Symmetry: C3
Subunit: 125 residues, 3 copies
């Protein structure tokens, strides 16, 4: 059971209020990261590890890791960071088939920023 | 073989000289992280990956990752960071049954801070 | 299939223009990290996760994660960070037998810095 991705941006600060569209692709063999939207689509249910290191050239930075719960049919910020120019973070999240995870930043308009996730434990039922 | 946890705090700077008691729980299905103490208890021996991203609102910050060696019957700082407001780190540690791992900070009294660990390789004997 | 390492330095800023020779060893049971050179040697082909948290006491810092592609017979910077005193990063990289991965920093001459990697998915053919 394989499902992983690692993507980059190579810029200072992308556009806010939208999913960060990471263009640079370090790994994406299962094609579970959508480069056209910046969202990771879960196709294998289980526990996933997400890690990111984002640089931001904005004021009042607000970094959020979103999860769209497919079964609950609603989106929420599973993780949030505030007022940090160089925001780093990592978290474990359990995902179901259809769930979506992506990164988002908010700030006021006035370096490799990464976003990595992989399946650690797959569900066994 | 599953053993993982990912926990948060959602505050600026917790209390020093004691294990950081992470209240927010992102994942804890094996119930190996003690929310009442902030210590992870190893129940499966093997190689574990620990990662943390702590924000601190204190002076002369001192971030330490402690390991209580059950067999050696003594506690030591397996990792330490000094004079960093936004401390990030990750490390691989081999643990035995009964070992304990936790985070601790020291500073002078005057944002999601995470602490994640999971079993990478379990011992085979 | 096991192949992992986690190493430290315990200093402020090592020497530039050369692979960072991490002397402190948190884990190295497969002996795939060369302490005399600072390079990780891949002996099991597959997808590897690399994470690092380097502190630097230099000006115009330039942190790079190098990969020597054994089959292509050439070395390139798989990851790069610029003008960051406390540089953190993580990435997934696929490696073949003979590939080498190491960290490198550039700066102008005027705290635990870690470097961790482990085999996530091994190739199955
Ligand atoms: Cl990290």
């Amino acid at each position: 059971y394989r499902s992983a991705f690692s993507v980059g941006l190579e810029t200072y600060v992308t556009i806010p209020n939208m999913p960060i569209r990471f263009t640079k692709i370090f790994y994406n063999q299962q094609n579970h990261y959508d480069g056209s939207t910046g969202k990771f689509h879960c196709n294998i249910p289980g526990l996933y590890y997400f890690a990111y290191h984002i640089t931001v050239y904005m004021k009042d930075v607000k970094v959020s890791l979103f999860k769209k719960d497919k079964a609950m049919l609603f989106t929420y910020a599973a993780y949030q960071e505030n007022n940090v120019d160089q925001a780093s973070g990592s978290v474990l999240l359990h995902l179901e088939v259809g769930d979506q995870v992506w990164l988002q930043v908010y700030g006021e308009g006035e370096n490799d920023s990464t976003f990595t996730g992989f399946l650690l434990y797959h569900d066994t039922n």
